[PDB]
Write a protein that binds this ligand. Structure first.
Ligand SMILES: Cc1ccc2c(c1)sc(-c1ccc(N(C)C)cc1)[n+]2C
Ligand SMILES: Cc1ccc2c(c1)sc(-c1ccc(N(C)C)cc1)[n+]2C
Ligand SMILES: Cc1ccc2c(c1)sc(-c1ccc(N(C)C)cc1)[n+]2C
Ligand SMILES: Cc1ccc2c(c1)sc(-c1ccc(N(C)C)cc1)[n+]2C
Ligand SMILES: Cc1ccc2c(c1)sc(-c1ccc(N(C)C)cc1)[n+]2C
Ligand SMILES: Cc1ccc2c(c1)sc(-c1ccc(N(C)C)cc1)[n+]2C
Ligand SMILES: Cc1ccc2c(c1)sc(-c1ccc(N(C)C)cc1)[n+]2C
Ligand SMILES: Cc1ccc2c(c1)sc(-c1ccc(N(C)C)cc1)[n+]2C
Lengths: 61, 61, 61, 61, 61, 61, 61, 61
C-alpha cells in the first residue's frame, strides 16, 4: 500500500555507439519474412506479449 | 494506496550514435514481409501486445 | 505493503560499442524466416511472453 | 511486507565492445528459420516464457 | 612534370560520432594556458608550422 | 616526372565512435599548460613542424 | 620518374570505438605541463618534427 | 625510377575497441611533465624526429 519507486529503470537502452561500413547489403525474400538491423530498441509491456524482432514465415490455418 | 513514482524510466532509449556507410543497399520482396533498419525506438504498452520490428509472411485463413 | 525500489534495473543495456566492416552481406529467403543483426535491445514484459529475436519457419495448422 | 530493493540488477548487459570484419557473409534459407548475430540483448519476463534468439523450423499441426 | 592527383586525401576527418554526458566540468586557470575538448579537426599546412591543440604556459623573454 | 597519385591518404582519421560519461571533470592550472581531450584530429604539414597536442610549461629565456 | 601511388595510407586511424565511464577525473597542475586523453589522432609531417602528445616541464634558458 | 606503391600502409592504426571504467582518476603535477591516456594514434614523419607520447621534466640550460 506504500509502493515507492525512485530512479528505477525497466526496458531501458542508453549509451550505444555503432559504426557499420558495408559495400553491398542485399535481401531477397520470396513469400517469407525477413527482419534485419534492429539497434537500440526498448519497450515495456504490461498484460500482453512483447516481441521486438520477430519474423514468422506464414500462418496458413 | 500511496504509489509514489519519482524519476522512473520505462521503455526509454537515450544516447545513441550511429554511422552507416554503404555502397549498395537493396531489398527485393515478392509477396512476403521485410523490415530493415530500426534504430532508437521505445514504447510502453498497457493491456495489449507490444511489437517493435515484426514481419509476418502472410495470414491465409 | 512497503515496497521501496531505488536505482534498480530490469532489462537494461548500456555502454555498447560496435564496429562492423563487411564487403558483402547477403540474405536469400524462400518461404522461411530470417532474423539478422540485433544489437543493444532491452525489454521488460509483465504477464506475457517476451521474445527478442525469434524466427519461426511457418505455422501450417 | 517490507521489500527494500536498492541498486539491484536483473537482466542487464553493459560494457560490451565488438569488432567484426568479414569479407562475405551469406545466409540462404529455404523454408526454415535462421537467426544470426544477436549482441548485447537483455530482458526480464514475469509470468511468461522469455526467449532471446530462438529459431523453430516449422509447426505443422 | 605530369603530376596527376585523383581522389587523394590529406588532413581529412570524417565519420565521427561523439556523446559526452557530464555533471560538472570546471576549468580554473591562473596565469597559464588550458586547452580542452578538441574534436574532429583537420588542417593542411604548406611551408609553415602546423599546430592543432597547443598550450604554452608563457613566454617571458 | 610522372607522379600519379590515386586514392591515397595522408593524415586521415575516419570511423570514430566515442562515449564519455563523467560525474566531475576538473582542471586546475597555476602558471603551467594543460591539454585535455583531443579526439579525431588529423593534419599534414610540408616543410614545418607538426604538433597536435603539445603543452609547454613556459619558456623563460 | 614514374612514381605510382595507389590506395596507400600514411598516418591513418580508422575504426575506433571508445567508452569511458568515470566518477571523478581531476588534474592539478602547478607550473608544469599535463596532457591527458588523446584518442584517434593521425598526422603526416614532411621535413619537420612531428609530435602528437608531448609535455615539456619548462625551458629555462 | 619505377616505384609502384599499391595498398601499402605506414603508421596505421585500425580496429580498436576500448572500455575504461574508473571511480577516481587524479593527476597532481608540480613543475614536471605528465602524459596520460594516449590511444589509437598514428603518424608518419619524413626527415624529422617523430615522438608520440613524450614527457620531459625540464630543460634548464
Ligand atoms: C503496490 C503495488 C502493487 C502492484 C504493483 C506495484 C505496486 S508496481 C507493479 C508493476 C507491474 C508490472 C510491471 N512491469 C510491466 C514490468 C512493473 C511493475 N505492480 C504489479
Ligand atoms: C498505485 C498503483 C497501483 C498499481 C500500479 C501503479 C500504481 S502503476 C502500475 C503499472 C502498470 C503497468 C505498467 N506497464 C505498462 C509496464 C507499469 C506500471 N500499476 C500496476
Ligand atoms: C509491493 C510489491 C509487490 C509485488 C511486486 C512489486 C511490488 S514489483 C513486482 C514485479 C513484478 C513483475 C516484474 N517483472 C516483469 C520481472 C518485476 C517486479 N511485484 C511482483
Ligand atoms: C514482498 C514481495 C513479494 C513478492 C516479490 C517481491 C516482494 S519482489 C518479487 C519478484 C518477482 C519476479 C521477479 N522477476 C521477474 C525475476 C523479480 C522479483 N516478488 C515476487
Ligand atoms: C608536380 C608536383 C610537384 C611537387 C608537388 C606536387 C606536384 S604536390 C606537392 C605537395 C607539397 C606539399 C604537401 N603538403 C603540404 C603535405 C603536399 C603535396 N609537391 C611537393
Ligand atoms: C615527382 C614528385 C616529386 C616530389 C614529390 C612528389 C612527386 S610528391 C611529394 C610529397 C611531399 C611531401 C608530402 N608530405 C607532406 C607527407 C607528400 C608528398 N614530393 C616531395
Ligand atoms: C617520384 C617520387 C620520389 C620521391 C618520393 C615520392 C615520389 S613520395 C616521397 C615521400 C616523402 C616523404 C614521405 N613522408 C612524409 C613519410 C612519404 C613519401 N618521396 C621521397
Ligand atoms: C624511387 C624512390 C626513391 C626513393 C623513395 C621512394 C621511391 S619511396 C621513399 C620513402 C621515403 C620515406 C618514407 N617514410 C617516411 C617511411 C617512405 C618512403 N623513398 C625514399
Amino acid at each position: 500500500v506504500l509502493y515507492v519507486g525512485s530512479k528505477t529503470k525497466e526496458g531501458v537502452v542508453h549509451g550505444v555507439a555503432t559504426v557499420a561500413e558495408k559495400t553491398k547489403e542485399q535481401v531477397t525474400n520470396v513469400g517469407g519474412a525477413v527482419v534485419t538491423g534492429v539497434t537500440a530498441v526498448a519497450q515495456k509491456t504490461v498484460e500482453g506479449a512483447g516481441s521486438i524482432a520477430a519474423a514468422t514465415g506464414f500462418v496458413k490455418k
